[PDB]
């Protein structure tokens, strides 16, 4: 565990993280994909051996000794708001189980289903609150990665409001 488990946010490429493991915003087929998934594929391509897993689940594959947790959020183009909400919550619960199982002291996480799986909606608050519901019972240091300046401010505000 971390001595004083924390949440932080950084605005940069998650492929340059300073944590003990990474969560990939994966597709269900273990394909190189786009966005976070493509950056992860370029940095840790070995982690895509048998990484395919269903929506709402997480599957960890080692790149050397560095764990890549492939977490599959729903594509809100295909799911109803109700069913997508359930699968997005479930993917984060599976991330918390994997982080715990691995015994890491820190984890780099993106906001699942906020990019090309968002169905064209702003899901910062929805995705971040499912992240908190899952990760709050873990004692890893959690570092949330984003790319947008306004999202960085809103994520930082949400972290600070609870402290
Ligand atoms: C910044 C923003 N606006 C809508 C959605 N997002 C996040 C994705 C990842 O670009
Ligand atoms: Cl960067
Ligand atoms: Cl996405
Ligand atoms: Cl972002």
Swiss-Prot record:
Post-translational note: Phosphorylated by host on serines and threonines.
Macro domain mapped to chain residues: 4-163
Residues given in the record as ADP-D-ribose binding sites: 13, 27, 35, 115-117
Result when mutating residue 117 to V/W: Almost complete loss of mono-ADP-ribosylhydrolase activity
Consequence of changing residue 27 to R/Y: Almost complete loss of mono-ADP-ribosylhydrolase activity
Task of the protein: Seems to be essential for minus-strand RNAs and subgenomic 26S mRNAs synthesis. Displays mono-ADP-ribosylhydrolase activity. ADP-ribosylation is a post-translational modification that controls various processes of the host cell and the virus probably needs to revert it for optimal viral replication. Binds proteins of G3BP family and sequesters them into the viral RNA replication complexes thereby inhibiting the formation of host stress granules on viral mRNAs.
This protein's name: Non-structural protein 3
Species annotation: Chikungunya virus (strain S27-African prototype) (CHIKV)
Covered residues, full protein: 1334 to 1493 of 2474
């Amino acid at each position: 565990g971390a001595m004083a488990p924390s949440y932080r946010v950084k605005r940069m490429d998650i492929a340059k993280n300073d944590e003990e493991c990474v969560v990939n915003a994966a597709n269900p087929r273990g394909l190189p994909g786009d966005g976070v998934c493509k950056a992860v594929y370029k940095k840790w391509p070995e982690s895509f051996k048998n990484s395919a897993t269903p929506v709402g689940t997480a599957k960890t594959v080692m790149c050397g000794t560095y764990p890549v947790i492939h977490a599959v959020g729903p594509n809100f183009s295909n799911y109803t708001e109700s069913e997508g909400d359930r699968e997005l919550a479930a993917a984060y619960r599976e991330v918390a189980k994997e982080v715990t199982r691995l015994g890491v002291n820190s984890v780099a996480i993106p906001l699942l289903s906020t990019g090309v799986y968002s169905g064209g909606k702003d899901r910062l608050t929805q995705s971040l609150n499912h992240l908190f519901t899952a990760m709050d019972s873990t004692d890893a240091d959690v570092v949330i990665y984003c790319r947008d300046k306004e999202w960085e401010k809103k994520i930082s505000e949400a972290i600070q409001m609870r402290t």
